[PDB]
Amino acid sequence: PSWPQILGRLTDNRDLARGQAAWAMDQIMTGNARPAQIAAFAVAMTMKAPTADEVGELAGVMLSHAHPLPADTVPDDAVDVVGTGGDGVNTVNLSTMAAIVVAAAGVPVVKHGNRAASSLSGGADTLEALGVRIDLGPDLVARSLAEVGIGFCFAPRFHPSYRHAAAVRREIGVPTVFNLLGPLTNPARPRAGLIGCAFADLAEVMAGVFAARRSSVLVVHGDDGLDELTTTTTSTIWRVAAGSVDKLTFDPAGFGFARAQLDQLAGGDAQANAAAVRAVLGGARGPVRDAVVLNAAGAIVAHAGLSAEWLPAWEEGLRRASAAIDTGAAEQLLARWVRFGRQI
Amino acid sequence: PSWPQILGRLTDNRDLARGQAAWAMDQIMTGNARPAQIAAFAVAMTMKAPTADEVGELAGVMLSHAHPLPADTVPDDAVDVVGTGGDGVNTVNLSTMAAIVVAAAGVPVVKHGNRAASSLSGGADTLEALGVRIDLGPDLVARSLAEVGIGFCFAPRFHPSYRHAAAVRREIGVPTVFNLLGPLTNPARPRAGLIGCAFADLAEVMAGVFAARRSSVLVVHGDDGLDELTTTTTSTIWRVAAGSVDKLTFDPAGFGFARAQLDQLAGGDAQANAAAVRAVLGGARGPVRDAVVLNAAGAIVAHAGLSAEWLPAWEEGLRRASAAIDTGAAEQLLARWVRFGRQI
Numbered sequence: 001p002s003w004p005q006i007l008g009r010l011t012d013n014r015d016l017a018r019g020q021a022a023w024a025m026d027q028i029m030t031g032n033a034r035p036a037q038i039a040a041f042a043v044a045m046t047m048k049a050p051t052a053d054e055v056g057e058l059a060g061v062m063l064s065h066a067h068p069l070p071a072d073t074v075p076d077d078a079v080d081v082v083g084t085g086g087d088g089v090n091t092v093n094l095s096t097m098a099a100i101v102v103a104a105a106g107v108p109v110v111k112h113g114n115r116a117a118s119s120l121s122g123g124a125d126t127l128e129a130l131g132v133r134i135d136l137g138p139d140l141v142a143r144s145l146a147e148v149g150i151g152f153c154f155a156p157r158f159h160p161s162y163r164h165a166a167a168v169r170r171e172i173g174v175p176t177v178f179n180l181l182g183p184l185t186n187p188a189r190p191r192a193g194l195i196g197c198a199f200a201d202l203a204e205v206m207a208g209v210f211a212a213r214r215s216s217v218l219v220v221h222g223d224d225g226l227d228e229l230t231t232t233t234t235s236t237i238w239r240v241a242a243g244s245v246d247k248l249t250f251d252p253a254g255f256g257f258a259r260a261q262l263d264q265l266a267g268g269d270a271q272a273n274a275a276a277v278r279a280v281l282g283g284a285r286g287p288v289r290d291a292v293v294l295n296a297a298g299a300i301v302a303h304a305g306l307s308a309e310w311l312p313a314w315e316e317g318l319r320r321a322s323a324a325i326d327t328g329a330a331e332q333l334l335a336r337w338v339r340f341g342r343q344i
Numbered sequence: 345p346s347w348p349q350i351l352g353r354l355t356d357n358r359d360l361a362r363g364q365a366a367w368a369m370d371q372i373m374t375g376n377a378r379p380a381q382i383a384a385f386a387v388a389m390t391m392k393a394p395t396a397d398e399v400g401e402l403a404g405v406m407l408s409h410a411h412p413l414p415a416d417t418v419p420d421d422a423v424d425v426v427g428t429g430g431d432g433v434n435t436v437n438l439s440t441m442a443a444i445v446v447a448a449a450g451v452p453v454v455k456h457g458n459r460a461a462s463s464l465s466g467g468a469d470t471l472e473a474l475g476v477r478i479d480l481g482p483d484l485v486a487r488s489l490a491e492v493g494i495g496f497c498f499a500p501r502f503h504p505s506y507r508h509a510a511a512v513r514r515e516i517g518v519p520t521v522f523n524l525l526g527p528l529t530n531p532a533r534p535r536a537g538l539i540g541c542a543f544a545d546l547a548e549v550m551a552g553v554f555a556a557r558r559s560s561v562l563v564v565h566g567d568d569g570l571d572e573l574t575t576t577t578t579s580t581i582w583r584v585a586a587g588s589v590d591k592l593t594f595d596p597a598g599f600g601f602a603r604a605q606l607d608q609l610a611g612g613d614a615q616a617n618a619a620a621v622r623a624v625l626g627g628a629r630g631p632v633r634d635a636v637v638l639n640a641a642g643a644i645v646a647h648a649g650l651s652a653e654w655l656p657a658w659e660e661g662l663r664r665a666s667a668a669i670d671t672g673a674a675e676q677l678l679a680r681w682v683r684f685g686r687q688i
């Protein structure tokens with residue numbers, strides 16, 4: 001393989017041959033690709049329309065180069081709650097709040113996360129503002145998971161070889177196929193997840209990648225644009241179970257949720273978003289709580305799918321998420337997580 | 345304007361707003377664009393499918409930044425004979441030979457040229473091997489045109505600000521919209537031309553750019569793939585006249601030309617191709633001569649179009665081209681051109 005061969009195939013609007021996307025990603029990850037070649041590749045794949053085979057190859061290479069967690073430290077039923085970002089709506093950190101609630105409900109959570117790219121505060125920024133240690137290595141993330149019930153894998157910490165691609169992504173600004181990779185590259189390789197996708201046209205491709213590795217995942221795109229399950233309107237869900245993908249539309253009104261306005265989910269800086277987390281975990285009722293409970297429930301549904309029915313699953317997920325907040329378990333879990341980090 | 349705005353519009357498969365392509369190109373030309381931004385733009389513009397308006401904006405900015413020729417030194421009726429290159433065929437230098445013949449016939453020629461990109465020897469390489477000074481500046485190109493009847497504008501000498509774009513093009517090694525710009529950016533701005541296009545689906549776009557300038561141009565694509573008028577089969581001609589374009593099919597058999605095989609036009613390195621020039625100018629009969637005469641006649645037809653009827657124009661062009669060789673005028677012009685460069 002060579003860059004002219006691969007780039008020419010893509011600019012001819014052709015799918016790549018098996019192995020070519022992987023070759024390309026490996027050149028990028030080993031520091032062997034010129035910034036121009038990285039940019040050409042990211043753009044050309046995006047404009048061709050990436051296939052699940054192609055995106056799976058890219059994610060596979062990233063996972064090969066990533067720092068793994070220690071053997072036998074990640075429960076077989078661990079779940080992720082993470083999105084692509086890039087929805088261009090400055091919301092509170094819904095996945096991060098959902099993940100705390102899910103862990104408090106007793107589902108092991110290994111969250112893949114990062115600082116902001118286009119927003120004012122990313123999940124990692126907000127966790128740091130809450131006093132949680134974001135920058136732990138493999139051994140300590142495994143300890144966090146075992147001791148607290150949740151671990152946070154900071155993407156730059158676990159994927160140092162991605163630094164060459166990350167730099168090009170910033171210079172060009174435009175979203176590309178690379179924006180799909182964060183949720184597909186959790187170094188703990190959890191088999192379940194609630195996965196947000198800001199890009200309606202690419203959510204099915206993400207779902208195809210998860211289907212190929214036989215994950216139990218709900219890939220979600222709010223019909224208002226959010227890379228979360230929204231409360232302002234319906235959401236599209238690509239449901240991944242038993243190696244296949246089912247496209248569904250989801251309406252929170254079927255579970256008694258009132259419609260919110262997008263303004264009601266608005267975020268601010270890390271300090272403001274930390275305050276918002278504290279408010280929800282402390283039992284504040286209102287729009288943000290509703291969105292957190294909904295997303296926590298979706299992750300619990302994904303976790304359930306590792307084994308059945310859609311409606312009892314949602315009912316159970318919503319019951320469990322709501323109780324995790326109401327009993328104070330979620331608030332207490334955050335306190336315990338903070339304490340864990342301060343004790344080395 | 346910004347890179348995220350323009351690249352986002354392209355990746356959404358939308359034509360640019362008026363001025364945006366020009367903004368991007370000026371960023372590239374002033375050294376304000378990162379190699380990643382240059383590459384993203386080149387690829388995204390190519391995959392979107394560039395319009396004549398957009399290509400014209402790109403060429404306009406190049407011309408703005410180019411070294412011009414001194415005032416009143418280029419005749420109103422000067423002609424160019426130049427192609428995009430990249431036809432993947434490795435032929436002798438047909439445009440460069442045709443240009444010498446056209447000048448010897450009395451039509452002023454200001455040829456835009458460059459070294460090999462994908463071929464074994466570019467027109468500039470072959471001229472250098474023949475002893476012609478290829479890198480003269482504006483004042484001396486103007487002198488060459490007046491004194492010898494032909495001038496050669498070396499693209500890197502006249503477009504120094506293009507160096508950043510040129511570096512990215514080499515790195516990505518795939519054709520893009522930038523491959524169209526050579527024939528569209530002759531710094532002497534001749535109003536007539538025989539312009540070869542290797543990319544059949546972009547020839548109409550190049551023709552539209554020339555139409556906007558009200559040039560008299562034949563944009564040509566050999567139906568065998570050559571970016572020249574071919575002798576192996578028919579050619580498609582986009583005839584540009586009176587600010588409008590007509591697509592025609594051209595068969596040189598109508599002028600008595602025997603069908604050649606593509607292999608009979610094969611070139612080699614600069615020394616081999618220089619030998620091929622000497623052979624044609626010395627009066628050797630055969631396929632190469634035929635191709636040179638046909639293309640010289642095409643350029644004469646384009647020159648006639650500044651004023652002209654189609655079939656008589658071709659018959660006249662063929663007569664004048666053949667006579668320029670047969671009298672030794674073309675051989676003598678080359679010798680005079682070599683002397684000119686040696687005498688400062």
Ligand SMILES: O=P(O)(O)OC[C@H]1O[C@H](OP(=O)(O)OP(=O)(O)O)[C@H](O)[C@@H]1O
Nearest residue numbers: 083085086093095096117118119122123
């Ligand atoms: O600034 P953006 O480009 O829009 O990115 C917003 C967030 O998207 C991902 O968030 P994640 O789902 O992990 O967390 P969140 O929903 O709690 O913010 C990403 O790592 C950022 O934290």
Ligand SMILES: O=P(O)(O)OC[C@H]1O[C@H](OP(=O)(O)OP(=O)(O)O)[C@H](O)[C@@H]1O
Nearest residue numbers: 427429430437439440461462463466467
């Ligand atoms: O090496 P390539 O990738 O195929 O492209 C290079 C050839 O295309 C142009 O040819 P021009 O028409 O000016 O000259 P020619 O036809 O005499 O070679 C260009 O300036 C090079 O000479």
Ligand SMILES: COc1cc(N)c(C(=O)O)cc1OC
Nearest residue numbers: 499500503504505506507510
């Ligand atoms: C317009 O064509 C060119 C302009 C240039 N400046 C350069 C360069 O600086 O290497 C190369 C070019 O084609 C190879």
Ligand SMILES: [Mg+2]
Nearest residue numbers: 082083095196
């Ligand atoms: Mg999220």
Ligand SMILES: [Mg+2]
Nearest residue numbers: 083085227228
């Ligand atoms: Mg979000």
Ligand SMILES: [Mg+2]
Nearest residue numbers: 426427439540
């Ligand atoms: Mg040519």
Ligand SMILES: [Mg+2]
Nearest residue numbers: 427438571572
């Ligand atoms: Mg050619």
